[PDB]
Design a protein around this ligand. Structure first.
Ligand SMILES: [Zn+2]
Ligand SMILES: [Zn+2]
Lengths: 101, 91, 196, 114, 195, 71, 96
């Protein structure tokens, strides 16, 4: 029943402190933009460093920033953008296991 | 077959294999040993409640409907918003 | 809704001469058993059945309130054919119903609770087995589940009522003729026309 | 998974949260008896539930005169030839025609399924 | 008498039983009332059937059922159950013998009759829900004999399979060459003929 | 029915300053007779009668004992 | 032996029953065709069927060759007793 959505949102209000603001910087493209939900410079640099480690292990920092910026543009929120970057890191890991460039 | 998939109702029970509710406050030391590596990878780069909701998806039904775990995750996000957390393995 | 969705299934019993349904744990407590361990001894015979235990757990979650025989009897008797204005009469009515109209074939004496509890536990156990898909549901058309009323049973059922009416009439006549205190007669008190 | 009972009132032990030591405690609603559990899992729900009936098959079915018998399937343990067999005999099974076997030798009761 | 024999034959009663010794014991019901438990169901059933066949303690009318899978023994002394007689097959041979046949065919001036056949343990009354634990054979000299083994554990045998028809359908000749609606119509029209 | 059930029905019936108490003991049944004399079934058919037998009972009367037979 | 594979859109029981009923229907129809084509030019069943007076080739087939399968509520005869049709069969017998 639609009563579930009222129950659910009540229980999540009862889960207050204010939400933390964005702070600008970084090697990442457009890193001064606050437009990506829940994003930060530290999360973007962590994803860029993960992409750089995978590309360097397969082998350059330009490709890592391109993979991070593409994924941050396509994902709905920064928490999903980071999970999809780790998924692309796992696919590069299957490429290196297959010996592919 | 693609249109057949598009036109047939399917909830999570049609594809889930098993589910359980655990008590695991430690992000690193996880009661379940299987998730260890990727849950640590998720937590290493950032409150929360100590309880868990661990579900297991049946592979046959997961691959029959041509579904994807990213699709399931984004559907969960759309359905519940960001008041949940979701971390998922891959195939 | 959220609470119904989490509970799932609950087990209730429809006792005769009672206004509406009663949860099963309430009846078991009214029989005089308090501990969940004892009630589960009466219901689940082999405790190494986690699926049965989980199935019966929501029924025990209705025992969060009721914990004693007196209050359980009160809850049962609150819903009589004519609800009472007092409480002792309601509790006596509840005990009377649980002693006279619930499972008469097991027994009607004072010490029949120890066996009525076992039979009610067997009913609940068979319900659980049906719900778990471990026994086939019965069919009414199976002829082992039927009886045939021949002349014996038919005429005996017919004769019980007529003998009861004859007793009622002789009782009425005796009381009317005795309030005067004069005397009393037997042949004049019996109406053979009733039975015939 | 299972139900555990308090030793004082003999009632069901509900799980309760200890918000100091980050530990799980089982406590009842009648008295103040506490406990620490080893399962560490409150609830488990499997929806496949394709239970193998070899746990639920009794060895006493070998005395049924109405069951078919075969001698081409010797018992694994005692090597007895004759062995009763039957089907799943389970409701709420979406689809099944697999056979099940029970050895007919007394006190063997070996119940397998090839 | 059934309750007394059950007590005599080591049947633990409900009020004298710990709730732990019930998982591995087969419950006993008499007229739908749970009276106790037992731990040797097979020997109990053998003894009960022997007593019913001897016609000593348990009347021939009483039925006994063992649900082997669900571990329950049900004994009915009720009125209204419908039952029919069946022959008894012990190993693979009928207990009915040529001596019985001759004593029956000398029925006059011999006071040997159906009751004396029943008292010998040759035939038996089987009600409907006792028929679910029995293996029947339609014809003795055709189904007891050695074949490609279908069943070698027959427990009873039919007297004659044509005794499944009622009064009005026992007058139709060659009913097995007919059509079922035609047999039904004749069963209807047999009550309207004039004689 | 005639042998057992009527007797059981009579017995299981509860019995009904000075006090009076009654208790029905046992029953009887003669062969069918006609009151204006055994009545044959053919005569019952011809004369539009009813083929029936009388049922008696022993009833005991007490005051706070006296026996009444064949009531 | 579990070697039977389900047909898409059908359960294992459904596909087994479909195969069995199809085999039996083929048998009944083949015997019927044999009985029809083995008739004679003087046969009175043929006289009353060809001219369209009364009867049918299925009736001729049931008279000569095979009565055929009996169905209850569109399915084969159900298990009235505990897992068997009659007390004369073993339990779990799916033969014709
Ligand atoms: Zn306690
Ligand atoms: Zn063996």
């Amino acid at each position: 029943k639609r009563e579930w959505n009222l129950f659910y949102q009540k229980q999540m209000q009862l889960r207050d402190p204010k939400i933390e603001e964005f702070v600008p910087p970084c090697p990442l493209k457009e890193a001064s933009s606050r437009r990506i939900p829940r994003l930060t410079v530290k999360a973007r640099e962590h994803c860029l460093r993960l992409l750089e480690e995978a590309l360097s292990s397969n082998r350059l920092r330009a490709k890592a920033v391109e993979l991070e910026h593409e994924t941050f543009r396509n994902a709905k929120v920064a928490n999903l953008y980071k999970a999809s970057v780790l998924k692309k890191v796992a696919d590069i890991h299957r490429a290196s296991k297959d010996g592919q460039p | 077959k693609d249109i057949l998939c598009r036109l047939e109702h399917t909830t999570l029970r049609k594809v889930t294999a098993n589910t359980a509710i655990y008590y695991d406050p430690n992000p690193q030391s996880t009661v379940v040993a299987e998730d260890q590596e990727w849950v640590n990878v998720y937590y290493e780069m950032p409150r929360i409640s100590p309880w868990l909701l661990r579900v297991e998806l049946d592979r046959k039904h997961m691959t029959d409907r041509k579904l994807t775990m990213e699709q399931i995750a984004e559907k969960i996000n759309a359905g519940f918003g960001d008041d949940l957390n979701c971390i998922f393995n891959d195939d | 809704g959220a609470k119904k969705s989490a509970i799932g299934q609950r087990i209730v019993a429809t006792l005769p001469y009672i206004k509406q349904e009663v949860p099963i744990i309430i009846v078991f407590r009214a029989l005089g058993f308090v501990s969940d361990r004892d009630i589960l001894e009466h219901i689940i015979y082999d405790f190494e059945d986690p699926e049965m235990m989980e199935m019966v757990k929501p029924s025990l979650d209705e025992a969060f309130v009721i914990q004693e025989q007196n209050v359980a009897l009160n809850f049962i008797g609150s819903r009589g054919a004519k609800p009472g204005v007092t409480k002792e009469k309601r509790i006596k009515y509840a005990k009377e119903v649980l002693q006279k109209e619930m499972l008469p074939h097991v027994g009607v004496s004072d010490f029949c609770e120890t066996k009525k509890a076992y039979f009610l536990g067997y009913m609940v156990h068979r319900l659980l087995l049906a719900a778990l898909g471990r026994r086939e549901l019965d069919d009414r058309d199976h002829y082992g589940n039927k009886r045939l009323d021949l002349a014996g049973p038919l005429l005996a059922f017919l004769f019980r009522g007529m003998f009861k009416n004859l007793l009622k009439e002789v009782r009425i006549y005796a009381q009317k003729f005795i309030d005067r205190g004069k005397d009393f007669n037997l042949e004049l008190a019996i109406k053979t026309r009733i039975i015939s | 998974v299972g139900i555990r009972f308090c030793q004082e009132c003999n009632n069901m032990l509900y799980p309760k949260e200890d918000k100091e030591n980050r530990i799980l405690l089982y406590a009842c609603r009648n008295c103040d008896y506490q406990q620490e559990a080893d399962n560490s899992c409150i609830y488990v729900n499997k929806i496949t539930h394709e239970v193998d009936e070899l746990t639920q098959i009794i060895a006493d079915v070998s005395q049924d005169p109405t069951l078919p018998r075969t001698e081409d399937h010797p018992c694994q343990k005692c090597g007895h030839k004759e062995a009763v067999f039957f089907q799943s005999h389970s409701a709420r099974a979406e689809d099944a025609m697999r056979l099940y076997y029970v050895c007919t030798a007394p006190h063997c009761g070996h119940r397998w399924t090839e | 008498p059934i309750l007394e024999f059950l007590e005599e034959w080591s049947m633990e009663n409900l009020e004298e039983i710990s709730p732990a010794a019930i998982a591995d014991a087969t419950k006993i019901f008499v007229n739908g009332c749970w009276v106790g438990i037992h731990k040797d169901p097979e020997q109990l059933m053998n003894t009960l059937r022997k007593l019913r066949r001897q016609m000593d303690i348990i009347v021939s009318e009483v039925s006994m059922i063992r649900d082997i899978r669900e571990r329950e023994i049900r004994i009915y002394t009720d009125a209204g159950r419908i039952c029919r007689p069946l022959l008894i097959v012990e190993k693979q041979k009928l207990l009915l013998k040529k001596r019985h046949i001759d004593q029956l065919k000398e029925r006059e001036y011999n006071n040997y009759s159906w009751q004396d056949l029943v008292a010998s343990g040759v035939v038996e009354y089987i009600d409907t829900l006792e028929e679910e634990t029995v293996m029947l054979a339609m014809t003795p000299d055709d189904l007891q004999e050695k074949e490609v083994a279908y069943c070698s554990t027959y427990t009873h045998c039919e007297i004659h399979p044509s005794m499944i028809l009622g009064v009005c359908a026992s007058i139709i000749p060659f009913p097995d060459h007919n059509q079922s609606p035609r047999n039904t119509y004749q069963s209807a029209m047999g009550k309207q003929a004039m004689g | 029915f005639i042998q057992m059930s009527v007797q059981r029905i009579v017995e299981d019936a509860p019995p009904i300053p000075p006090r009076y108490l009654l208790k029905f003991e046992q029953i009887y049944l003669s062969k069918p007779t006609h009151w204006e004399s055994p009545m044959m079934p053919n005569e019952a058919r011809l004369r539009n009668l009813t083929y029936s037998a009388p049922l008696y009972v022993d009833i005991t009367k007490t005051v706070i004992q006296t026996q009444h037979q064949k009531t | 032996n579990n070697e039977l594979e389900p047909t898409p859109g059908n359960t294992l029981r459904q596909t087994f029953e479909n195969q069995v009923n199809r085999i039996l229907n083929d048998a009944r129809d083949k015997t019927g065709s044999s009985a029809q084509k083995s008739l004679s030019e003087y046969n009175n069943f043929k006289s009353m069927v060809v001219s369209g007076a009364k009867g049918s080739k299925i009736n001729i087939s049931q008279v000569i060759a095979v009565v055929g399968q009996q169905n209850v509520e569109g399915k084969r005869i159900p298990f009235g007793f505990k897992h068997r049709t009659l007390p004369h069969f073993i339990k779990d017998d799916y033969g014709p």
